Design a protein around this ligand. Sequence first.
Ligand SMILES: *Cc1c(COP(=O)(O)O)cnc(C)c1O
Ligand SMILES: *Cc1c(COP(=O)(O)O)cnc(C)c1O
Lengths: 350, 346
Amino acid sequence: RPPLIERYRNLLPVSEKTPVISLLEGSTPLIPLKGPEEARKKGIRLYAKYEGLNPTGSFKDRGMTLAVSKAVEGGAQAVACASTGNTAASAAAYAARAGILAIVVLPAGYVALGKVAQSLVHGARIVQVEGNFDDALRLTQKLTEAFPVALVNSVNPHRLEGQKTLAFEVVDELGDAPHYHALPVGNAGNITAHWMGYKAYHALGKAKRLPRMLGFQAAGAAPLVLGRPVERPETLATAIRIGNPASWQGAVRAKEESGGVIEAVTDEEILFAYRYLAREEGIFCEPASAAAMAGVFKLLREGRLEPESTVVLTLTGHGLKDPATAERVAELPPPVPARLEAVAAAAGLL
Amino acid sequence: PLIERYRNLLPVSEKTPVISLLEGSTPLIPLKGPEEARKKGIRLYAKYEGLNPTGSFKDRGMTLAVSKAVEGGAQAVACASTGNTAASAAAYAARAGILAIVVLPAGVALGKVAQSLVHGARIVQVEGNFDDALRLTQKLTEAFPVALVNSVNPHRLEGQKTLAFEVVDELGDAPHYHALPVGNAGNITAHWMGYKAYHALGKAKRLPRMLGFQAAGAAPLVLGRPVERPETLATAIRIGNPASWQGAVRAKEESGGVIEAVTDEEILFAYRYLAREEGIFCEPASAAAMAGVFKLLREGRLEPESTVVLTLTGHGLKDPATAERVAELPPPVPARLEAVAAAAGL
Ligand SMILES: *Cc1c(COP(=O)(O)O)cnc(C)c1O
Ligand SMILES: *Cc1c(COP(=O)(O)O)cnc(C)c1O
């Protein structure tokens, strides 16, 4: 696992003066999937780029390594965001690695300790303000303008450049870009970066073809499917519970230029794919990440994937990011006497 | 795949069905410090096993144990524990299309087994104690087509030995010292096996001194006798009678290393240090390895200019309870730039 910035140095906005703040993120496994049967019946091969195996458990590490490295190169004493999720955790981990502050501004009483616990252990400075979520974003902006603090939010150009490397790794591995590439779409910075990576590698000549990007959003938070912002987003897939994507334009360009789509999958569909990956492929990912697999199931049922094609799915986060969704009251059989036969019977071996 | 990468050094053949989640090949992250180490030119590297498919190094052993189990036509794998072994076993069982059985004493925080459950593991609770569950799992794997995938399965040790191969492959040689946590001691046994094997190959031009560490409240190998009431927030190494006891002692003696204890406070300190200073979030049991290095460092027991590798066994995401316990949310401040800057430490 080389530092991501070093693996693609000549293709990234870095110089010899750029301080490489790396946790050896990237270079994640591209697991060939066994099925599903719907796909095998048509010679369609699926590969899961397992981004949950990045340092903080999310693909965001790809963008953060570059963003914090550049921030430091600029003399920044800290980075900031107004996120309560995987962004804050990634920012905090890299800030810690750099020896600088990670600042997260949020409306008081909004988040639970459990959700920001990861970023806090990394020493994140979480500032709850007595105001609205608009007050937090705003105060964040001014912090970035009055002090040496870099904003590492969704639109940070460096986060997008770093996230582009995922496409590079896929082509390096497969020998070419896949026919299709599915992934979840929240603020849409990831699908925008994926498309950037593919176009860049294509121009470089390492990728002969360009994949059709397949973006999927939860039905309850599908502004890019609906073609309008969603004021009241909702879904068990927290990572993509977004009503106004920050990289809206980037997503639409990626979709259009790649000849792809951005469609919706229901929470039931997301939950189904979530279970499928865990029980059938042995891959535990976040519900939002599962949306990508739900998306492939959807198009397979609709007969919209060409036979004999290759499909790559970016499973964005690790299942451990959201234990709650995995801890529904199990309702396990009652205990059995400490007798072997009883045990084998309970284990279903008889 | 790990099994393919080290095919010639593992007990496999063309007949072995490879059940892999592409585990292994984890990052060997060079640590910035601590200062105590920089002071003596002692370089530290963290082999981050928390980035394996299920979040712990055990996947190294599980891929081999399950693959061999299937080679023998096993209809299932089983273990008498909660936590990482259960989760790793369940994930690979799912991958292979066979059952994962987890036998536990009756009377169980779903968090201890939620990860194995999401993979579809079958939990069987028996009305008896820990020994009854283990005794029953043993008899179960002897009578039925079920492989026992606990710390003493020989295939798990062989698979886990690969960690040493990778460390040598990347550094270009074996390190002067290799620290890691010790629960059932299968991991330290495997690490030594790996170094010995690479030594026979000429890959390692030196043998590292193995430095094992246990939580003070669960340090049987440090006390020379079993602990009937093991205690420690470091759940993964809260083991009173290590199943791979002799293997550990041999690793310690033959390598000229040690197996010492660190307190829960020292473990939390190392845990905070890794995340806050190196940006590495690991499970508390894993931090005991860094705690151990901190200990020998202040005792002046690590040769200057030497290389020290630490196996951080699991990912911090494995233990949210401890993370929440350590985390603290500051009180709200007014929504004013000066109040925010002040609180952000600017
Ligand atoms: C941030 C995140 C997303 C959403 O990605 P965008 O670039 O906002 O579209 C999806 N899944 C996970 C696990 C994430 O962390
Ligand atoms: C299993 C485990 C240990 C203990 O390893 P032993 O082989 O039992 O010595 C330590 N840390 C983690 C994260 C583990 O999963």
